[PDB]
């Protein structure tokens, strides 16, 4: 059996924290994974003893006390994902990794110059369809899901224009028909007071 | 409550080498 | 670095149908593992190999599964009679050694077993052009893509500028939203944004295409209904730049 | 106070017999061995089971790996006759139940054919047997047992056959 | 009659419990020890040229060696703590018997554990360290030991004393 903590972790961009795994029996060696958005497990560490360091990551494993840790410093956007520890039971007959519960790690993007606004975007192939874009709000703001069930609101997502070293959050809202407008799109949530609302 | 024993898991050795 | 290949990325099957999954271990790795990962991030070991020979497998694998690692063919795991409880991410891992070093995992196969395949639907894709207001207020231009009305959530969205796939300035929703949450088999929707500079969007020669890969039925799967057979397909939506 | 001990895990795979074994040793004595064909842990003394346990399938995997390694060792590249000693476990008193020990030692490969003989005929009852036990070197040893009732009329023989022998030997024992 | 043997003995050596532990893995093919892993070395070392390919193979794999070096802890010390509950403190009290032969006084010490034992012949209360003939420590193979300590003399009160970890006080049997 493996006990992993914490269950979830929201770390601000550029800050650090640590994950832990306790083992109820003797492990030959421990593996640490990062499971990204795609769902593919990235190898972080293999260690049967002591401490290993890999870039912004660091891992320690102590066989006697039957526990292992993983330290993350200077958190980046790509650090997001679910982190798993896994080990081989030295007393286990089946040759296999025993996995931890997992740590779902979220990285809060640092928005330097916020510019909250809601824009209206027309369909390229039609003249009736359009969507609403709440963008450039800082990461503090939460995007609450709609209640009308006729209107659809996605959660916020951060994009990175790498060449310009720029980052922005946005949420998309759309509706089939017909009373729906962008000025009332994101009002099931709390948007900033100085939000820029253009006049179509 | 009997304590489970640990054991040595054997290792795979490769070919490609020969001796007279 | 070791790379493990797994196909298909997604897979949907009806109850009772066989569910075959293929895996190609890292070159030079004699040992192969198979795991199950469910929605609760629980991992369950299924079977391991040393070259062509099965060495260990749990009871469920011996009774319900058929695994193989021959030469002349990729490794494979096959459920003989798919049940709802089989729905999981099937991971394949290879190792240079038996139990002495790191296991390297492939992308896995997201298998979903349904009661039937009557409610399988492809997505409808539309691209939404940047607003004039954004372009003048921020001098940047955001395109939005909307994949809608698909089931299940077995899609992969990608952006293509001038015929080439881009990754910068893009983010897709971490998970699809239900068009009608009350329904068990509710069709899904998915949004994604691609942001470019204003001067790049303001060029008639620049072509923007949103591509959604949809995983569904094959030609082998039987389809006895009126509408179009919801097969594996790519649905797209385009947009050209505007100088304005 | 000083506690000096040597715990040994000992496993092998033999061709063309296609037989593998797996056992633990404590200061020269067997702790347990795994029945490979049945995948079960067999303790030397039954009481041991209350203190420890072993997942027998772990040994099956090792033998599978050893079997493959043996083929590697075959591609990459005489017999040793056994010493046979026959003795009683306890001092022999007439009418008092005892056990004869047939000690096969310093031999290889680990394959023997032992036949207890009471008065010139084989005995299939009250006979016990050990697996192939480790030595300090590269050779094996083995214990064979026979329960018997001491009398002045009976004589016993332990017939041991091995590939290192031109002829099966028999060590004699009588009161 | 050809035969082929793949033989591996993984030895945990405890020089004083878990205070000082040495792991020694020994690989054998047929009648020849070819490969070793000494935890005091930290890597594999060929005993003969047949074992060298495996040494160079496994020693070039950091993760392998790392797991091996930890087995002093993860396997050896793990199992010792368990065996320390019933195997290490195991005590079986010896049965001592004196009887004449041919003269030759025989002190039979039977069914005892552990093997650590001391048997002394006394003549009228004085130890006799001469004329002693022994079979030495004999292993019965079922976790019991026996031994015959014989005195080769012609007799008034001969005494055989046995000391053993299972005894708080020495056991004494006299022969007049
Ligand atoms: C031998 O090891 C002892 C401790 O080992 C413990 O017991 C083993 C059975 C094993 O399980 C191991 O893992 C354990 O940790 C030494 O420790 C002595 O222990 C007593 C009580 O147990 C303690 O009061 C002493 O302070 C402690 N001494 C030392 C030096 O650590 C033995 O030391 C011997 O005992 C002393 C009383 C002293 O006479 C010392 O000179 C002795 O060596 C170790 N002995 C030897 C010979 O190595
Ligand atoms: C591991 O053990 C430590 C100390 O007992 C405890 O503080 C910690 O919460 C444990 N972690 C888990 C995941 O149980
Ligand atoms: C946003 O939601 C999270 C939970 O999802 C909560 O912990 C956080 O406090 C919220 N932030 C604000 C500003 O309300
Ligand atoms: C062992 O010996 C007995 C009698 O001596 C014989 O019946 C049996 O066939 C022998 N087995 C082998 C394998 O030699």
Automatic annotation (TrEMBL), chain E:
Domain Ig-like: 94-174
Localisation per UniProt entry: Membrane
Positions of disulphide bridges: 12-76, 107-160
GO cellular component: MHC class II protein complex
Membrane topology, from the record: Single-pass type I membrane protein
Coiled-coil boundaries: none
Domain of life: Eukaryota
UniProt keyword terms in alphabetical order: Adaptive immunity, Disulfide bond, Glycoprotein, Immunity, Membrane, MHC II, Signal, Transmembrane, Transmembrane helix
Glycan attachment residues as annotated in the record: 16
GO terms for biological process, alphabetical: adaptive immune response; antigen processing and presentation of exogenous peptide antigen via MHC class II
Record bears the keyword Membrane: yes
Family membership: Belongs to the MHC class II family.
Protein name: MHC class II antigen IEk-beta
Organism the protein comes from: Mus musculus (Mouse)
Gene: H2-Eb1
Included stretch of the parent chain: 30 to 215 of 263
């Amino acid at each position: 059996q493996v006990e992993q903590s914490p269950s979830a972790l929201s770390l601000h961009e550029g800050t650090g924290s640590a994950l832990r795994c306790n083992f109820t029996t003797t492990m030959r060696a421990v593996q640490w994974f990062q499971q990204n958005s795609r769902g593919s497990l990235i190898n972080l560490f293999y260690l049967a003893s002591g401490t290993k360091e890999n870039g912004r990551l660091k891992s320690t494993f102590n066989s006697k006390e039957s526990y292992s840790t993983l330290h993350i410093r200077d958190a980046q956007l790509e650090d997001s994902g679910t982190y798993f520890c896994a080990a081989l039971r030295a007393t286990g007959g089946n040759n296999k990794l025993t996995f931890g519960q997992g740590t779902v790690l979220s990285v809060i993007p640092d928005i330097q110059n916020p510019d909250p606004a809601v824009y209206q975007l027309r369909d390229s192939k039609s003249s009736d369809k359009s969507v609403c874009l709440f963008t450039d709000f800082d990461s503090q703001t939460n995007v609450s899901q709609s209640k009308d069930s006729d209107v659809y609101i996605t959660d916020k997502c951060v994009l990175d224009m790498r060449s310009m070293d720029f980052k922005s959050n946005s949420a998309v809202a759309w509706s089939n028909k017909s009373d729906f407008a962008c000025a009332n799109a994101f009002n099931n949530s709390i948007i900033p007071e100085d939000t820029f609302f253009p006049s179509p | 409550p009997a304590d489970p024993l640990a054991f040595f898991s054997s290792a795979i050795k490769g070919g490609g080498g020969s001796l007279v | 670095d070791p790379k493990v290949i797994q196909t298909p990325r997604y897979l949907v099957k009806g109850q009772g149908q066989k569910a075959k999954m293929r895996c190609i271990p890292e070159k030079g790795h004699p040992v192969v593992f198979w795991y199950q990962q469910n929605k609760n991030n629980e991992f369950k070991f299924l079977i391991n190999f040393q070259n062509q020979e099965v060495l260990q497998q749990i009871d469920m694998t011996e009774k319900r599964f058929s695994a193989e690692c021959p030469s002349n063919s990729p490794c494979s795991l096959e459920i003989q009679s798919s049940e709802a409880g089989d729905s999981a991410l099937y991971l394949c891992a290879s190792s240079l050694n038996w139990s002495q070093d790191t296991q390297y995992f492939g992308p896995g196969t997201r298998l979903l077993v349904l009661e039937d395949l009557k409610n399988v639907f492809p997505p409808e894709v539309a691209v939404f052009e940047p607003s004039e207001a954004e372009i003048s207020h921020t001098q940047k231009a955001t395109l939005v893509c909307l994949a809608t009305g698909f089931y299940p959530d077995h899609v992969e969205l990608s952006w293509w500028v001038n015929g080439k796939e881009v990754h910068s300035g893009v983010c897709t929703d971490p998970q699809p939203l239900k068009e009608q949450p009350a329904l068990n088999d509710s069709r899904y929707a998915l949004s994604s944004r691609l942001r470019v500079s204003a001067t790049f969007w303001q060029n008639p020669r620049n072509h923007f295409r949103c591509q959604v890969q949809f995983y569904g039925l094959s030609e082998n799967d039987e389809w006895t209904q009126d509408r179009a057979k919801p097969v594996t397909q790519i649905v797209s939506a385009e947009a050209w730049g505007r100088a304005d | 106070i000083k506690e000096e001990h040597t715990i040994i895990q000992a496993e092998f795979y033999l061709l063309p017999d296609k037989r593998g074994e797996f056992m633990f040793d404590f200061d020269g004595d067997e702790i347990f061995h795994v029945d490979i064909e049945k995948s079960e842990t067999i303790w030397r003394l039954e009481e041991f089971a209350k203190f420890a346990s072993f997942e027998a399938q772990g040994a099956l995997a090792n033998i599978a790996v050893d079997k493959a390694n043996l083929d590697v060792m075959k591609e990459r590249s005489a017999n040793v006759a056994p010493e046979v000693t026959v003795l009683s476990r306890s001092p022999v008193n007439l009418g008092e139940p005892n056990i004869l020990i047939c000690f096969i030692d310093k031999f290889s490969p680990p394959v023997v054919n032992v036949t207890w003989l009471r008065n010139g005929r084989p005995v299939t009852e009250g006979v016990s047997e050990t697996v192939f036990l480790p030595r300090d070197d590269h050779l094996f040893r083995k214990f064979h047992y026979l329960t018997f009732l001491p009398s002045t009329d009976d004589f016993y023989d332990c017939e041991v056959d091995h590939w290192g022998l031109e002829e099966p030997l028999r060590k004699h024992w009588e009161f | 009659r050809p035969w082929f043997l793949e033989y591996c003995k993984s030895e945990c050596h405890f020089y004083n419990g878990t205070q000082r532990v040495r792991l020694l893995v020994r690989y054998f093919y047929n009648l020849e020890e070819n490969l070793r892993f000494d935890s005091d070395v930290g890597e594999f070392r060929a005993v003969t040229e047949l074992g060298r390919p495996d040494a160079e193979n496994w020693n070039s794999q950091p993760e392998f060696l790392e797991q091996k070096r930890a087995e002093v802890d993860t396997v050896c010390r793990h199992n010792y703590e368990i065996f320390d509950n019933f195997l290490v403190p195991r005590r079986v009290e010896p049965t001592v018997t004196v009887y004449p032969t041919k003269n030759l006084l025989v002190c039979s010490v039977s069914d005892f554990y552990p093997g650590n034992i001391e048997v002394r012949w006394f003549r009228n209360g004085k130890e006799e360290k001469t004329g002693i003939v022994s079979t030495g420590l004999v292993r019965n193979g079922d976790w019991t030991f026996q031994t015959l300590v014989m005195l080769e003399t012609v007799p008034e009160v001969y005494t055989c004393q046995v000391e053993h970890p299972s005894l708080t006080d020495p056991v004494t049997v006299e022969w007049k």
